[PDB]
Design a protein around this nucleic acid. Sequence first.
RNA 1: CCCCACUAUGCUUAGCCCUAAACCUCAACAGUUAAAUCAACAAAACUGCUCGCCAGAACACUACGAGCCACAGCUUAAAACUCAAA
Lengths: 49, 97, 100, 86, 135, 137
Amino acid sequence: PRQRAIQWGEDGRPFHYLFYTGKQSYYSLMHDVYGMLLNLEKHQVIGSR
Amino acid sequence: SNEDLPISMENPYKEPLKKCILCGKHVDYKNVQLLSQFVSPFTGCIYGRHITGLCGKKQKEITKAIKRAQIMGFMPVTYKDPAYLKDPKVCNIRYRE
Amino acid sequence: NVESFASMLRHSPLTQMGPAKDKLVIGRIFHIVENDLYIDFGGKFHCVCRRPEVDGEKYQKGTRVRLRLLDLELTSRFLGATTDTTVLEANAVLLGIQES
Amino acid sequence: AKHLKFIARTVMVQEGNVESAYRTLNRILTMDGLIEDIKHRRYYEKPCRRRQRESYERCRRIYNMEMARKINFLMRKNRADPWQGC
Amino acid sequence: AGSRLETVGSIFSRTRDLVRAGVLKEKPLWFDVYDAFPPLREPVFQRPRVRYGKAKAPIQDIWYHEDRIRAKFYSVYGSGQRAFDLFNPNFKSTCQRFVEKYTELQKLGETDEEKLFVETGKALLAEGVILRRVG
Amino acid sequence: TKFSIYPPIPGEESSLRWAGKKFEEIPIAHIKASHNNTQIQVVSASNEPLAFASCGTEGFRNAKKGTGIAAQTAGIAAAARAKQKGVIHIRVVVKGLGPGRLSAMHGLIMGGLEVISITDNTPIPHXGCRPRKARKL
RNA sequence: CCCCACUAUGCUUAGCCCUAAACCUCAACAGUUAAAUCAACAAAACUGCUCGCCAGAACACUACGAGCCACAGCUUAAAACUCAAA
Ligand code: FES
Ligand SMILES: [K+]
Ligand SMILES: [Mg+2]
Ligand SMILES: [Mg+2]
Ligand SMILES: [Mg+2]
Ligand SMILES: [Mg+2]
Ligand SMILES: [Mg+2]
Ligand SMILES: [Mg+2]
Ligand SMILES: [Mg+2]
Ligand SMILES: [Mg+2]
Ligand SMILES: [Mg+2]
């Protein structure tokens, strides 16, 4: 089971800035999608599921 | 010390307190026209202050004036005198259809 | 000759305005959600005004608008509460757009 | 008894619409408290019971008016989510 | 070994004491910084209490002498049809322009209030300012 | 002119007429809507009796004397005897909150009478006789 | 219990009787909002001062005595036996 390798180095510092959320991968994705919605504003079905 | 520090005083922007429509006016039991503006047209019932908008003091003066005027022979009890149906409507009550 | 805080506060436009009720101010739309315009006017909190029916498309992010202020912060204390409930927004009426 | 008749509690009929005239009269008597006053007067309410009900009613109105005020105040923020995704 | 009694003293006092008692083998990384540059108030839990009787908060309302002139100006002439621009830190409203002229004329020795207010309006009208009396 | 729900005041000069008769001259239908019965008397403006009908006089008895259909039947009966005497328009004065309060008025209309106004005269004492004690049911 | 009739009584007057879940179930006065806020619930927690009152349950709004326009009454108010709870 691909449990991610230890999420911190020898010094104990987590690698990801959202580590302490406990859901860094999910919230890193929400952060990236929320950021894209912002940039668009500044600039401005059957086939798949 | 410092000139720009705040100074103690009373609120200069304070607004005056609200006043009822009858604040500062004498309520006489003989002035049936005024008293009639605070009774029901169909039943003669005295309106509460939530309908008349009067303050506690004037609500009492009007009530006492109506009761005096009614039993002394100046004002009807069971209905508003029809002569006063076209006076200014100062009461927050809607009746008809 | 360093300006003190008491001096900044005395001569600030927000201090000079006095009470905010029925005061005309210039706001700036900084965020838009559908037909809800989020407008900053220099206070602690923004106000939220619905897009006007006429010339709705003229109101965009960055558009400067004219407002009539009612409250800088909408707060009320309800029965049985030790503090005040705040919605964290100002109350204002959107009049139109500011143009030169 | 001693008053003039056909003034108190009198509604005129319009275009033969007696149903609307009766509803208007019933609405007048209700708002003035007569309908509920006639009903409470069919049997004697004991003074201790009247004070209890008059105090309960007074407090339910204050509580309902205060709960409406709270809901109106906290419904200003019912708008769509401005920061969706965060 | 430690203490999670957050309402007993402060993190500094609890940490200092357990280090003395030998319970903590090493000091935490922040302890030496707190000691060198401590806060103005030691962070000790307190329970906020409600005031009763004749107890009142010490906060005072902020008022200025010119506020009296502003209250009268708004009553007499209302809020200016010109719109406040609170983003400009040097914005001057018609009321502030009125207050500054009112202050100048007072320093010229005039002391009457009703007379010092009428002369100020005339000066601004001479300068081209629009003063529409509300009533 | 706009319609007024307020009745014309006697002594004033109104333009309203019903078969050439003024409001003060229209006969009156007195409806007593009790809890167990309904009584209807039609009288002239001079207080001359013209017709009387009640649920009891229409053959209803006991618990049947107090229903809507019983009052409606009494209204039709009073309307018939009143129409024979020359009555078309009536002023309705109803006292009481019984079941035949509104139904008695319908029967008067189905019987050929036109109601021009409705007046409530339900007795309300302003302080009066002490009512009987609550029923223990 | 429901319906009808009707009385003492509710009213007035002149005397009595002196009771209530007569209860905000909060003694009077003065003071405080800082300490620990505080068994619980009620009704935020206390200080000074004074009077009244209380000391397991039940016996007991009882017995006796005493006083009272009260006479099947009121006020004051025990003990014995009994229990390990109340
Ligand atoms: S508000 Fe002043 S008498 Fe009513
Ligand atoms: K009680
Ligand atoms: Mg008797
Ligand atoms: Mg009496
Ligand atoms: Mg009592
Ligand atoms: Mg005492
Ligand atoms: Mg507690
Ligand atoms: Mg004992
Ligand atoms: Mg007893
Ligand atoms: Mg005894
Ligand atoms: Mg004895």
